[PDB]
């Protein structure tokens, strides 16, 4: 019993973190096979970041200007290329700790673990979600760029995020491992404001199922609703519209608990309209939206 | 910027988890040097757990009855002993991945990371605190016993917790790595009720400092207080008494922010008396007490 914000075990990713230095900039890289992946802004001065021309800045860089250190051992850079907003540094040594891996581009509402790193050294691991406005709410200090987000399926690491940017509002932006930003963000120190950070409805519903499984039941009510009726209320409260696809995804939790998805929507509707009245659900005073239905099933079933 | 509930990177501990089976019971063990540590209740049937005589049950067990598996490889058990509520299984192979380590017994209010495991396989990592009633609020399913709690200081793992028990109220009890339960709990399926789960005041104050550092400032008010005045209010709200030792520990965060500890106590006093009025602090609608002052300094400074 109990339900925690849980990250994947980080060891497989710890084995891939390296330090990348270009001139006076140090950040983190991800070493998979004989390629180190890092943010292309490693080549920028903070001055450069105001209006960088990355192709032009990169012309002034050679393989020997990219200093890659794995623990206390230097890696030899034998090639470099820019793919979107990441650099791929080809090294002469395959990472002996390379796990089975995939690069995946996640959808808003999907969760992942972040291994926050500084100077190629892991500092901590925490759980994030891709927000509906394609930001994440992370914990990243100067030096954390190139820290990665991932999911694990048994022994395969799916890398989904690399940290690039903090917005003036203190939320975070980054790329997939092909170097494409999530959302509209750019690797430039400019006016970038995030859109509405809506609540991930299907994740709240999943977490309410987790609450019922773990004995927190006070919020269950005598009501039901329809998707359209629920969505009128979701819209008013800046919740994401619930789709039949979301209802289908919640089916296993519905089955496990015997609470119909639309009954749980009616419980959520009352919580939105009535508030928590000073009560908590799984130790939270707000409706938690950074557990996916898959997360809830995984944690409630004990997948390794 | 940003402030997350962050666990230590788990890799060093992942390298120590093994499966222990005795008859029909499978749980987790911790393999350090040539010793595997596990809960002594591995030797119990669920029937046994109602009133176990561990010395008597252990007489019926031989080295060859303790099946220890590290990944898909069997370890040879060459001795076994009971120390308090843990078994120490001596194996013929030192764990080649043994990190630098210590066994520490933590105080209530101290935080640690848990690597939840099933069948010796890591499932997830999350951050816990030793509650003032010597329970923890974990996420543990059947098979999770022997999962461990730890802190890391650079490259040294301090193991502080091993999971043994779930109370009928769904909170968790366990031991240090000498096999001594935290608090009054026993490894028996009996009436064990937890005492008051008071709020860890010094940790709330630390987290309010973290909030100010990360730009959440709305709760700062024009007031101050005294330890005695604050403590009258703490007592009323089931907060732990704040001591001068706690004030001394918050000194570095006081210095960093320029907010005197007693001024922050007066902000906390108003939050207790007035509530949050539907506002949040670092994404929480309640006052978070599972960050120590050391955690806040570590996460705000980026220690690896």
Coordinates of C-alpha atoms in Angstrom, one line a residue:
Chain A
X1 CA 0.0 0.0 0.0
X2 CA 0.9 3.7 -0.3
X3 CA 1.4 5.7 -3.5
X4 CA 4.5 7.8 -4.1
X5 CA 5.8 10.1 -6.9
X6 CA 8.3 7.5 -8.1
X7 CA 11.1 7.8 -10.6
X8 CA 12.7 4.9 -12.5
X9 CA 15.9 3.6 -11.1
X10 CA 18.6 5.8 -12.5
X11 CA 21.6 3.4 -12.7
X12 CA 21.3 2.7 -16.4
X13 CA 21.3 6.4 -17.2
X14 CA 24.0 7.3 -14.6
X15 CA 26.3 5.0 -16.7
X16 CA 25.8 7.3 -19.7
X17 CA 26.4 10.8 -18.2
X18 CA 29.6 12.7 -19.2
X19 CA 30.9 16.2 -18.9
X20 CA 31.1 18.3 -22.1
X21 CA 33.1 21.6 -22.1
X22 CA 33.4 24.0 -25.1
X23 CA 35.7 27.0 -24.2
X24 CA 34.3 28.3 -20.9
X25 CA 30.9 26.4 -21.1
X26 CA 30.5 23.1 -19.2
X27 CA 27.3 21.1 -19.3
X28 CA 26.3 17.4 -19.5
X29 CA 26.3 14.9 -22.3
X30 CA 24.7 11.6 -22.9
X31 CA 27.1 8.9 -24.1
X32 CA 25.4 6.0 -26.0
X33 CA 27.5 3.7 -28.2
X34 CA 30.3 6.0 -29.7
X35 CA 28.2 9.2 -29.7
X36 CA 27.9 11.9 -27.0
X37 CA 24.7 14.0 -27.3
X38 CA 24.6 17.5 -25.8
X39 CA 22.8 20.8 -26.2
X40 CA 24.3 22.8 -29.1
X41 CA 24.3 25.9 -26.9
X42 CA 27.5 24.4 -25.3
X43 CA 29.3 26.4 -28.1
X44 CA 27.7 29.8 -26.9
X45 CA 29.0 32.4 -24.5
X46 CA 26.0 33.8 -22.4
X47 CA 26.5 36.9 -24.8
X48 CA 26.1 34.5 -27.8
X49 CA 22.8 33.2 -26.3
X50 CA 21.0 36.6 -26.9
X51 CA 21.0 36.0 -30.7
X52 CA 23.1 33.0 -31.6
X53 CA 23.8 31.8 -35.3
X54 CA 24.7 28.2 -34.4
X55 CA 25.9 27.3 -37.9
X56 CA 28.3 30.3 -37.8
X57 CA 29.5 29.6 -34.3
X58 CA 30.0 26.0 -35.0
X59 CA 32.4 26.8 -38.0
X60 CA 34.9 28.1 -35.4
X61 CA 34.8 24.8 -33.4
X62 CA 37.0 21.7 -34.1
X63 CA 36.7 18.2 -32.6
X64 CA 39.5 19.1 -30.2
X65 CA 37.5 22.1 -28.8
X66 CA 34.9 19.6 -27.4
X67 CA 36.3 18.3 -24.1
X68 CA 34.4 15.1 -23.1
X69 CA 35.2 13.6 -19.7
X70 CA 33.6 10.3 -18.5
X71 CA 34.4 10.1 -14.8
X72 CA 38.1 11.2 -14.6
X73 CA 38.9 9.8 -18.1
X74 CA 39.0 11.9 -21.3
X75 CA 37.2 10.7 -24.4
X76 CA 38.7 11.4 -27.9
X77 CA 36.3 13.3 -30.2
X78 CA 36.7 12.1 -33.8
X79 CA 33.7 13.9 -35.3
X80 CA 30.9 16.4 -34.5
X81 CA 27.7 17.3 -36.2
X82 CA 24.6 19.4 -35.4
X83 CA 21.2 17.7 -35.6
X84 CA 18.5 20.3 -34.9
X85 CA 19.4 21.7 -31.4
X86 CA 21.8 18.9 -30.3
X87 CA 25.4 18.2 -31.0
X88 CA 26.4 14.6 -31.7
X89 CA 30.1 14.2 -30.7
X90 CA 31.5 11.0 -32.2
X91 CA 34.1 9.5 -29.8
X92 CA 36.6 6.7 -30.5
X93 CA 35.2 4.5 -27.6
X94 CA 31.8 3.0 -27.4
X95 CA 30.3 3.5 -23.9
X96 CA 30.8 0.1 -22.3
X97 CA 27.7 0.7 -20.1
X98 CA 25.4 1.6 -23.0
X99 CA 22.0 0.1 -22.1
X100 CA 19.4 -1.0 -24.5
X101 CA 17.8 2.3 -25.6
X102 CA 15.4 4.1 -27.9
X103 CA 14.8 7.8 -28.6
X104 CA 11.1 8.6 -28.3
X105 CA 9.3 11.9 -28.6
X106 CA 6.6 12.0 -25.9
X107 CA 3.2 13.7 -26.0
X108 CA 2.0 16.2 -23.5
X109 CA 0.7 14.6 -20.3
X110 CA 3.4 11.8 -20.5
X111 CA 5.6 11.5 -17.4
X112 CA 9.3 10.6 -17.3
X113 CA 12.2 10.6 -14.8
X114 CA 14.9 13.2 -14.9
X115 CA 18.5 12.5 -13.8
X116 CA 19.7 16.0 -12.8
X117 CA 23.4 16.2 -13.4
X118 CA 26.2 18.8 -13.0
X119 CA 29.7 18.4 -14.6
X120 CA 28.6 14.9 -15.9
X121 CA 27.8 13.8 -12.2
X122 CA 24.4 12.7 -11.2
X123 CA 22.9 14.8 -8.3
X124 CA 19.3 13.5 -8.1
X125 CA 16.4 11.8 -9.8
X126 CA 12.8 13.1 -9.9
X127 CA 9.6 12.5 -11.8
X128 CA 8.3 15.2 -14.4
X129 CA 5.5 15.4 -16.9
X130 CA 5.5 17.0 -20.3
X131 CA 3.0 19.9 -19.5
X132 CA 0.2 20.6 -22.1
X133 CA 2.1 23.9 -22.9
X134 CA 5.2 21.7 -23.7
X135 CA 7.2 23.0 -20.7
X136 CA 8.3 20.9 -17.7
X137 CA 8.5 22.0 -14.1
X138 CA 12.0 20.7 -13.2
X139 CA 14.8 21.4 -10.8
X140 CA 17.7 22.7 -12.9
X141 CA 20.6 25.0 -11.8
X142 CA 23.3 26.4 -14.1
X143 CA 25.4 23.5 -15.3
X144 CA 22.3 21.1 -15.5
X145 CA 21.8 21.4 -19.3
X146 CA 22.1 18.1 -21.1
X147 CA 20.5 16.3 -18.1
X148 CA 18.0 13.8 -19.6
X149 CA 14.5 12.5 -19.1
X150 CA 13.7 8.9 -19.7
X151 CA 11.3 6.0 -19.1
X152 CA 12.4 2.3 -18.7
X153 CA 10.6 -0.7 -20.1
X154 CA 12.3 -3.7 -18.2
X155 CA 15.9 -3.2 -19.5
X156 CA 15.3 -0.7 -22.4
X157 CA 15.8 3.0 -21.6
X158 CA 13.6 5.3 -23.8
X159 CA 15.2 8.7 -23.7
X160 CA 12.6 11.5 -24.3
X161 CA 14.0 14.7 -23.0
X162 CA 17.3 16.7 -22.8
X163 CA 17.4 19.9 -20.8
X164 CA 18.2 23.1 -22.6
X165 CA 16.5 26.3 -21.3
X166 CA 14.9 28.0 -18.3
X167 CA 12.1 30.5 -19.2
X168 CA 12.0 33.8 -17.4
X169 CA 9.0 32.3 -15.4
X170 CA 11.3 29.5 -14.0
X171 CA 9.8 26.6 -16.0
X172 CA 11.9 24.5 -18.3
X173 CA 12.2 23.7 -22.0
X174 CA 14.1 21.2 -23.9
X175 CA 14.3 18.8 -26.8
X176 CA 13.9 15.1 -27.6
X177 CA 17.2 13.3 -28.4
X178 CA 16.8 14.2 -32.1
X179 CA 17.3 17.8 -31.0
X180 CA 13.7 19.0 -31.6
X181 CA 12.3 21.3 -28.9
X182 CA 9.1 20.3 -27.3
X183 CA 6.6 23.1 -28.1
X184 CA 7.5 26.4 -29.6
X185 CA 10.7 27.1 -27.7
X186 CA 14.1 28.0 -29.1
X187 CA 17.6 27.9 -27.7
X188 CA 18.0 31.7 -27.5
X189 CA 17.8 34.1 -24.5
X190 CA 14.7 35.9 -25.7
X191 CA 11.1 36.6 -24.7
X192 CA 9.5 33.1 -24.6
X193 CA 6.3 33.0 -22.6
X194 CA 4.6 29.7 -21.9
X195 CA 0.9 29.2 -22.7
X196 CA -1.8 28.0 -20.3
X197 CA -0.5 25.2 -18.0
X198 CA -3.8 23.1 -18.1
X199 CA -4.3 20.1 -15.8
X200 CA -3.8 16.7 -17.4
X201 CA -7.3 15.3 -16.7
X202 CA -6.7 11.6 -17.6
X203 CA -3.7 11.7 -15.1
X204 CA -5.8 13.2 -12.3
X205 CA -8.4 10.4 -12.9
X206 CA -5.7 7.8 -12.8
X207 CA -4.4 9.2 -9.5
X208 CA -8.0 9.2 -8.1
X209 CA -8.1 5.4 -9.0
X210 CA -4.7 5.0 -7.2
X211 CA -6.3 6.8 -4.2
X212 CA -9.2 4.4 -4.1
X213 CA -6.9 1.3 -4.5
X214 CA -4.8 2.7 -1.6
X215 CA -7.9 3.3 0.6
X216 CA -8.4 7.1 0.2
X217 CA -12.2 7.0 -0.8
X218 CA -13.8 10.0 0.9
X219 CA -14.3 11.9 -2.4
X220 CA -16.3 9.1 -4.1
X221 CA -19.9 10.4 -4.5
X222 CA -23.3 9.2 -5.6
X223 CA -23.1 10.9 -9.1
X224 CA -22.2 10.2 -12.7
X225 CA -21.7 12.4 -15.7
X226 CA -21.1 12.3 -19.5
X227 CA -17.9 13.2 -21.4
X228 CA -19.6 16.3 -22.7
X229 CA -21.0 17.4 -19.3
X230 CA -17.6 16.7 -17.7
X231 CA -15.8 18.6 -20.4
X232 CA -17.9 21.8 -19.9
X233 CA -16.6 21.7 -16.3
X234 CA -13.0 20.7 -17.3
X235 CA -12.9 23.8 -19.7
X236 CA -14.1 26.1 -16.9
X237 CA -11.2 24.8 -14.6
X238 CA -8.4 24.8 -17.3
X239 CA -8.4 21.0 -17.4
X240 CA -7.6 19.2 -20.7
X241 CA -10.7 17.8 -22.5
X242 CA -11.3 14.1 -21.7
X243 CA -11.6 12.0 -24.9
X244 CA -13.0 8.5 -25.4
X245 CA -9.4 7.4 -26.0
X246 CA -8.6 8.6 -22.3
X247 CA -11.7 6.6 -21.1
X248 CA -10.4 3.5 -22.9
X249 CA -6.9 4.0 -21.3
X250 CA -8.5 4.1 -17.8
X251 CA -10.5 0.9 -18.5
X252 CA -8.1 -1.5 -16.6
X253 CA -8.3 0.8 -13.5
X254 CA -12.1 1.0 -13.8
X255 CA -12.2 -2.8 -13.9
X256 CA -9.8 -3.3 -11.0
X257 CA -11.8 -0.9 -8.7
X258 CA -15.3 -1.4 -10.2
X259 CA -15.7 2.4 -10.5
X260 CA -16.9 3.4 -14.0
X261 CA -14.7 6.0 -15.6
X262 CA -17.7 8.5 -15.9
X263 CA -18.5 7.9 -12.2
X264 CA -14.9 8.9 -11.3
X265 CA -15.3 11.9 -13.7
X266 CA -18.4 12.9 -11.6
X267 CA -16.2 12.6 -8.4
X268 CA -13.6 14.9 -10.1
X269 CA -16.3 17.3 -11.2
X270 CA -17.5 17.7 -7.5
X271 CA -13.9 18.1 -6.3
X272 CA -13.4 20.9 -8.9
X273 CA -16.6 22.7 -7.9
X274 CA -16.5 22.1 -4.1
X275 CA -12.7 22.0 -3.5
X276 CA -11.0 19.7 -1.0
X277 CA -12.5 21.5 2.1
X278 CA -9.1 21.1 3.9
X279 CA -8.9 17.3 3.2
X280 CA -6.1 15.4 1.4
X281 CA -6.0 12.6 -1.2
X282 CA -2.8 10.4 -1.1
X283 CA -1.2 13.2 1.0
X284 CA -2.0 16.0 -1.5
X285 CA -4.2 19.0 -1.0
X286 CA -4.4 19.5 -4.8
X287 CA -5.4 17.1 -7.6
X288 CA -2.1 15.4 -8.8
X289 CA -1.7 15.2 -12.6
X290 CA 1.8 13.8 -13.0
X291 CA 0.9 10.1 -12.8
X292 CA -0.3 8.5 -16.1
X293 CA -2.7 5.6 -16.1
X294 CA 0.3 3.4 -17.0
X295 CA 2.2 4.8 -14.0
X296 CA -0.7 4.0 -11.7
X297 CA -1.0 0.4 -13.0
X298 CA 2.8 0.0 -12.8
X299 CA 3.2 1.2 -9.2
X300 CA 0.0 -0.6 -8.0
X301 CA 1.2 -3.9 -9.6
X302 CA 5.0 -3.6 -8.7
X303 CA 6.6 -3.9 -12.3
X304 CA 10.5 -4.2 -12.3
Chain B
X1 CA 15.4 27.2 -10.6
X2 CA 12.5 24.9 -9.6
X3 CA 12.4 22.7 -6.5
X4 CA 11.5 19.0 -6.8
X5 CA 11.1 16.1 -4.4
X6 CA 14.4 14.5 -5.4
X7 CA 15.8 11.1 -4.6
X8 CA 19.5 10.2 -4.7
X9 CA 20.6 8.5 -7.9
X10 CA 20.0 4.8 -7.2
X11 CA 22.7 3.1 -9.3
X12 CA 25.1 2.4 -6.4
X13 CA 22.2 0.7 -4.5
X14 CA 20.7 -1.1 -7.6
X15 CA 24.1 -2.9 -7.8
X16 CA 23.5 -4.4 -4.3
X17 CA 19.9 -5.7 -4.6
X18 CA 19.4 -9.5 -4.6
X19 CA 16.5 -11.9 -4.3
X20 CA 16.2 -14.0 -1.1
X21 CA 13.8 -17.0 -0.9
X22 CA 13.2 -19.2 2.1
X23 CA 10.7 -21.9 1.4
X24 CA 7.7 -20.1 -0.2
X25 CA 8.7 -16.6 0.9
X26 CA 10.6 -14.3 -1.6
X27 CA 11.8 -10.8 -0.7
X28 CA 14.8 -8.6 -1.3
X29 CA 18.2 -8.6 0.2
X30 CA 21.1 -6.1 0.3
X31 CA 24.5 -7.6 -0.8
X32 CA 27.5 -5.7 0.6
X33 CA 30.9 -7.4 0.6
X34 CA 30.2 -11.1 1.3
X35 CA 27.0 -10.5 3.4
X36 CA 23.4 -10.4 2.3
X37 CA 21.1 -8.5 4.7
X38 CA 17.4 -9.3 4.7
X39 CA 14.3 -9.2 7.0
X40 CA 14.3 -12.2 9.4
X41 CA 10.6 -12.7 8.5
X42 CA 11.8 -14.3 5.3
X43 CA 11.7 -17.5 7.4
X44 CA 7.9 -17.1 8.3
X45 CA 4.8 -18.4 6.6
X46 CA 2.0 -15.7 6.8
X47 CA 0.6 -18.1 9.5
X48 CA 4.0 -17.8 11.4
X49 CA 3.7 -14.0 11.3
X50 CA 0.8 -13.9 13.8
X51 CA 3.1 -15.0 16.7
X52 CA 6.5 -16.0 15.4
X53 CA 9.3 -17.4 17.6
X54 CA 12.2 -16.4 15.3
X55 CA 14.9 -18.3 17.2
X56 CA 12.8 -21.5 17.1
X57 CA 11.9 -21.0 13.4
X58 CA 15.5 -20.3 12.5
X59 CA 16.7 -23.7 14.1
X60 CA 14.8 -25.5 11.2
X61 CA 16.7 -23.5 8.6
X62 CA 20.1 -24.4 7.0
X63 CA 22.4 -22.3 4.8
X64 CA 21.0 -24.3 1.8
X65 CA 17.4 -23.2 2.6
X66 CA 18.3 -19.5 1.9
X67 CA 18.2 -19.1 -1.9
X68 CA 20.1 -15.9 -2.9
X69 CA 20.0 -14.9 -6.5
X70 CA 21.9 -11.8 -7.9
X71 CA 20.4 -11.2 -11.4
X72 CA 20.2 -14.7 -12.9
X73 CA 23.2 -16.0 -10.9
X74 CA 22.8 -18.0 -7.7
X75 CA 25.0 -17.1 -4.7
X76 CA 26.4 -19.8 -2.3
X77 CA 25.4 -19.3 1.3
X78 CA 28.2 -20.4 3.6
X79 CA 26.7 -19.0 6.9
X80 CA 23.7 -17.3 8.4
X81 CA 23.0 -15.4 11.6
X82 CA 20.3 -13.3 13.1
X83 CA 21.1 -9.8 14.4
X84 CA 18.0 -8.2 15.9
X85 CA 15.3 -8.3 13.2
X86 CA 17.7 -9.0 10.2
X87 CA 19.4 -12.0 8.8
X88 CA 23.0 -11.8 7.7
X89 CA 23.6 -14.4 5.0
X90 CA 27.3 -14.9 4.5
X91 CA 28.0 -15.8 0.8
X92 CA 31.2 -17.1 -0.8
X93 CA 31.5 -14.1 -3.2
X94 CA 32.0 -10.4 -2.3
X95 CA 29.6 -8.2 -4.2
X96 CA 31.9 -6.8 -7.0
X97 CA 29.7 -3.6 -7.1
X98 CA 29.8 -2.9 -3.3
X99 CA 30.0 0.8 -3.0
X100 CA 31.6 2.7 -0.1
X101 CA 29.0 2.4 2.6
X102 CA 28.0 3.0 6.2
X103 CA 25.1 1.8 8.3
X104 CA 23.5 4.8 10.1
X105 CA 20.4 5.0 12.3
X106 CA 18.6 8.2 11.4
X107 CA 16.5 10.5 13.7
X108 CA 12.9 11.4 13.1
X109 CA 12.6 14.2 10.5
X110 CA 15.5 12.9 8.5
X111 CA 14.8 12.1 4.8
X112 CA 16.2 9.3 2.7
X113 CA 15.7 7.7 -0.7
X114 CA 14.0 4.3 -1.1
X115 CA 14.8 1.9 -3.9
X116 CA 11.5 -0.1 -4.0
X117 CA 12.4 -3.6 -5.3
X118 CA 10.5 -6.9 -6.1
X119 CA 12.3 -10.3 -6.5
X120 CA 15.7 -8.4 -6.2
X121 CA 14.8 -6.1 -9.1
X122 CA 14.6 -2.3 -8.7
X123 CA 11.1 -0.9 -9.6
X124 CA 11.4 2.7 -8.6
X125 CA 13.0 5.3 -6.4
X126 CA 11.3 7.9 -4.2
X127 CA 12.1 10.2 -1.3
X128 CA 10.8 9.4 2.3
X129 CA 11.2 10.9 5.7
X130 CA 11.4 9.2 9.1
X131 CA 8.1 10.5 10.6
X132 CA 8.1 11.7 14.2
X133 CA 6.1 8.5 15.1
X134 CA 8.9 6.4 13.5
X135 CA 6.7 5.3 10.6
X136 CA 7.4 6.1 7.0
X137 CA 4.8 6.7 4.3
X138 CA 6.2 4.6 1.5
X139 CA 5.0 2.7 -1.6
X140 CA 5.4 -1.0 -0.8
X141 CA 3.5 -4.0 -2.2
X142 CA 3.9 -7.7 -1.2
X143 CA 7.5 -8.7 -2.2
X144 CA 9.0 -5.3 -1.4
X145 CA 10.3 -6.2 2.1
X146 CA 14.1 -5.9 2.2
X147 CA 14.0 -2.8 0.0
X148 CA 16.3 -0.2 1.5
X149 CA 16.5 3.5 2.4
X150 CA 19.7 5.4 2.0
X151 CA 21.5 8.8 1.7
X152 CA 24.6 9.4 -0.5
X153 CA 27.5 11.7 0.5
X154 CA 29.5 11.9 -2.8
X155 CA 30.5 8.2 -3.3
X156 CA 29.5 6.8 0.2
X157 CA 26.1 5.2 0.6
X158 CA 24.7 5.5 4.1
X159 CA 22.0 2.8 4.5
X160 CA 19.5 3.9 7.1
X161 CA 16.3 1.7 6.5
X162 CA 15.2 -1.7 5.5
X163 CA 11.5 -2.3 4.9
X164 CA 9.8 -4.9 7.1
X165 CA 6.1 -4.2 7.8
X166 CA 2.9 -2.4 6.7
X167 CA 0.6 -1.4 9.6
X168 CA -3.1 -2.0 9.3
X169 CA -3.4 1.9 8.6
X170 CA -1.2 1.4 5.5
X171 CA 2.0 3.2 6.8
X172 CA 5.3 1.4 6.9
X173 CA 7.8 0.2 9.6
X174 CA 11.2 -1.1 9.4
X175 CA 14.7 -1.3 10.8
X176 CA 18.1 0.1 10.4
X177 CA 20.8 -2.2 8.9
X178 CA 21.6 -3.5 12.4
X179 CA 18.1 -4.9 12.5
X180 CA 16.6 -2.6 15.1
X181 CA 13.1 -1.3 14.3
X182 CA 12.5 2.4 14.2
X183 CA 10.1 3.2 16.9
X184 CA 8.1 0.6 18.9
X185 CA 7.2 -1.7 16.0
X186 CA 7.8 -5.5 15.9
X187 CA 7.9 -8.0 13.0
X188 CA 4.6 -9.6 14.0
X189 CA 1.2 -9.4 12.4
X190 CA -0.5 -7.9 15.5
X191 CA -2.2 -4.7 16.7
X192 CA 0.4 -2.0 16.1
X193 CA -1.1 1.5 15.9
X194 CA 1.1 4.5 15.1
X195 CA 1.2 7.6 17.4
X196 CA 0.5 11.2 16.2
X197 CA 2.1 12.0 12.9
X198 CA 3.3 15.5 13.7
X199 CA 4.7 17.8 11.1
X200 CA 8.5 18.3 11.0
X201 CA 8.6 22.0 11.6
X202 CA 12.3 22.6 10.8
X203 CA 11.7 20.8 7.4
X204 CA 8.7 23.1 6.6
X205 CA 10.8 26.1 7.4
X206 CA 13.6 24.8 5.1
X207 CA 11.1 24.3 2.3
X208 CA 9.7 27.9 2.8
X209 CA 13.3 29.1 2.4
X210 CA 13.5 26.9 -0.8
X211 CA 10.3 28.6 -1.9
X212 CA 11.7 32.1 -1.4
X213 CA 15.0 31.1 -3.2
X214 CA 12.9 29.8 -6.2
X215 CA 10.7 33.0 -6.3
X216 CA 7.5 31.9 -4.4
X217 CA 7.3 34.8 -1.9
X218 CA 3.6 35.6 -1.4
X219 CA 3.5 34.1 2.1
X220 CA 6.2 36.4 3.5
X221 CA 4.6 38.8 6.0
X222 CA 5.5 41.9 8.1
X223 CA 5.7 39.9 11.3
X224 CA 8.2 38.1 13.6
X225 CA 7.8 35.8 16.6
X226 CA 9.8 34.1 19.4
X227 CA 10.5 30.4 19.7
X228 CA 8.2 30.2 22.7
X229 CA 5.3 32.1 20.9
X230 CA 5.8 30.0 17.7
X231 CA 5.9 26.8 19.7
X232 CA 2.5 27.6 21.4
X233 CA 1.1 27.7 17.8
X234 CA 3.1 24.6 16.7
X235 CA 1.7 22.6 19.6
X236 CA -1.9 23.6 18.6
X237 CA -1.3 22.4 15.0
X238 CA 0.6 19.1 15.8
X239 CA 3.9 20.6 14.6
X240 CA 7.1 19.5 16.3
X241 CA 8.6 22.0 18.8
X242 CA 11.3 24.2 17.2
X243 CA 14.5 24.2 19.2
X244 CA 17.5 26.6 19.1
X245 CA 19.4 23.6 17.5
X246 CA 16.8 23.8 14.5
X247 CA 17.3 27.7 14.3
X248 CA 21.1 27.1 14.1
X249 CA 20.6 24.5 11.4
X250 CA 18.5 27.0 9.3
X251 CA 21.3 29.7 9.7
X252 CA 22.8 29.2 6.2
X253 CA 19.4 29.5 4.5
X254 CA 18.6 32.6 6.7
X255 CA 22.0 34.1 5.5
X256 CA 21.4 33.2 1.8
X257 CA 17.9 34.8 1.8
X258 CA 18.4 37.5 4.5
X259 CA 15.1 36.3 6.1
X260 CA 15.7 35.8 9.9
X261 CA 14.6 32.3 11.0
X262 CA 12.1 33.8 13.5
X263 CA 10.6 36.0 10.7
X264 CA 10.1 32.8 8.6
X265 CA 8.5 31.2 11.8
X266 CA 6.1 34.2 11.8
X267 CA 5.3 33.5 8.1
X268 CA 4.6 29.9 9.0
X269 CA 2.5 30.8 12.0
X270 CA 0.2 32.9 9.7
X271 CA 0.0 30.1 7.2
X272 CA -1.1 27.7 10.0
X273 CA -3.7 30.2 11.4
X274 CA -4.9 31.5 8.0
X275 CA -4.4 28.5 5.7
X276 CA -3.3 28.8 2.0
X277 CA -6.5 30.5 0.8
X278 CA -6.4 28.3 -2.4
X279 CA -2.8 29.4 -3.1
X280 CA 0.2 27.1 -3.6
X281 CA 3.9 27.1 -2.6
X282 CA 6.3 25.3 -4.9
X283 CA 3.3 23.5 -6.5
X284 CA 2.0 22.3 -3.1
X285 CA -1.4 23.2 -1.4
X286 CA 0.0 22.0 2.0
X287 CA 3.2 22.8 3.9
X288 CA 5.8 20.2 2.8
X289 CA 7.9 18.6 5.6
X290 CA 10.0 16.0 3.7
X291 CA 12.9 18.3 2.8
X292 CA 15.6 18.8 5.5
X293 CA 17.6 22.0 5.6
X294 CA 20.5 20.0 4.2
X295 CA 18.3 18.7 1.3
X296 CA 17.3 22.3 0.5
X297 CA 20.9 23.5 0.5
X298 CA 22.0 20.5 -1.5
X299 CA 19.3 20.9 -4.2
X300 CA 19.6 24.8 -4.3
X301 CA 23.5 24.4 -4.7
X302 CA 23.6 21.4 -7.1
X303 CA 25.8 18.9 -5.1
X304 CA 26.8 15.7 -7.0

